[PDB]
């Protein structure tokens, strides 16, 4: 059967992409990245947290 | 389409096993366990005698459009037990030698209602 | 399957593919 085409894409409930502050492009994108990779980290014993990690 | 649907949901040539496992294995080989269907029956034998049920060759008439088999065959009634209609589906078997009550259309069985005994 | 009769079936079928061909030529 080819009647079940696009089954999920129609029935996946919409979520309006909410407005959020745009990230600073260019070299400043690397200026902010370099900050939270070297200069703000504290020595914390325990396993290293992933950049998106949440449980 | 309706005829082969009967031969999938109600027919199996040689029933290898006859036990509770065999009811639990024939029912996911056909696609009948998604979701697990409550009870189902499967006939054994040759098809020409199953085809003989639509007329008075080996068939007597029974309520609107249904027909009893004159001579009996072997059947297997598998009952799903367990309050979850989602897999893993747990069935219990029943062997026997019973008649069939099929509702055939255009000469071809499509729906088997009951498997009865002859007369008490 | 043995590698011996799989050679034999490939010899009786081979003699057929010639014998059906020679009469046509």
């Amino acid at each position: 059967s080819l009647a079940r085409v696009g089954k999920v894409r129609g029935q996946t409930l919409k979520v309006a992409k909410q407005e959020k502050k745009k990230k600073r492009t260019g070299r400043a994108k690397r200026r902010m990245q370099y900050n939270r990779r070297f200069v703000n980290v504290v020595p914390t014993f325990g396993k290293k947290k992933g950049p998106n990690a949440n449980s | 389409s309706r005829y082969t649907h009967f031969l999938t949901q109600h027919y199996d040539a040689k029933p290898q096993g006859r036990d509770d496992r065999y009811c639990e294995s024939i029912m996911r080989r056909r696609g009948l366990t998604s979701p697990c269907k409550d009870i189902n029956t499967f006939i054994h034998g040759n098809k020409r005698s199953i085809k003989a049920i639509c007329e008075n060759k080996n068939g007597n008439p029974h309520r609107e459009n249904l027909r009893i088999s004159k001579s009996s065959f072997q059947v297997t009634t598998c009952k799903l037990h367990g309050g979850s209609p989602w897999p893993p589906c747990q069935y219990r078997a029943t062997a026997g030698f019973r008649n069939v009550v099929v509702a055939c259309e255009n000469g071809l069985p499509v729906h088997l209602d009951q498997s009865i005994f002859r007369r008490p | 399957m043995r590698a011996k009769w799989r050679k034999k079936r490939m010899r009786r079928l081979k003699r057929k593919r010639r014998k059906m061909r020679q009469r046509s030529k």
């Binding site: 059967s1 080819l2 085409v5 696009g6 089954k7 999920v8 894409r9 129609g10 | - | -």
Partner: protein
């Protein structure tokens, strides 16, 4: 090498010319018979007319109905089973419409889940199937 004479450069050239034929990846490109069975003929893409939308079933327990397309080539006249790439894009492609079919990426081999197909559609009627799935470009009716 095995023969290490001072003037055996001919024998050393013929072998890497002869035994080079026993290389499978070499013999495919240095013999045009593979280019004969190639429906494209050495091209990156090809255009054709769709005539039907096939459903080809999977093989392994990753079993599902893959939505494919039987395309008829409009430069050589062959008939090819393409594949509608994205999810639920079979409604975008219409019947008897020109399509840009391409290789799948494995270059002449059935690619895992889908049997006997090497070909996917990238465009329809000069419109990409990425833009249709993203909705940035629609079919003008």
């Amino acid at each position: 090498g095995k023969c290490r004479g001072l003037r055996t450069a001919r024998k050393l050239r013929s072998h890497r010319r002869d035994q080079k034929w026993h290389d499978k990846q070499y013999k495919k490109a240095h013999l045009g018979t593979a280019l004969k069975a190639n429906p494209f003929g050495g091209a990156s893409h090809a255009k054709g007319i769709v005539l039907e939308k096939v459903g080809v079933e999977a093989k392994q327990p990753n079993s599902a109905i893959r939505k494919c397309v039987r395309v008829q080539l409009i430069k050589n006249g062959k008939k090819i089973t393409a594949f509608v790439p994205n999810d639920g894009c079979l409604n975008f492609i219409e019947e008897n419409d020109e399509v840009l079919v391409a290789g799948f990426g494995r270059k002449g081999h059935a690619v895992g889940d889908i049997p006997g197909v090497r070909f996917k559609v990238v465009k329809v009627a000069n419109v990409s199937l990425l833009a249709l799935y993203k909705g940035k470009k629609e079919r003008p009716r």
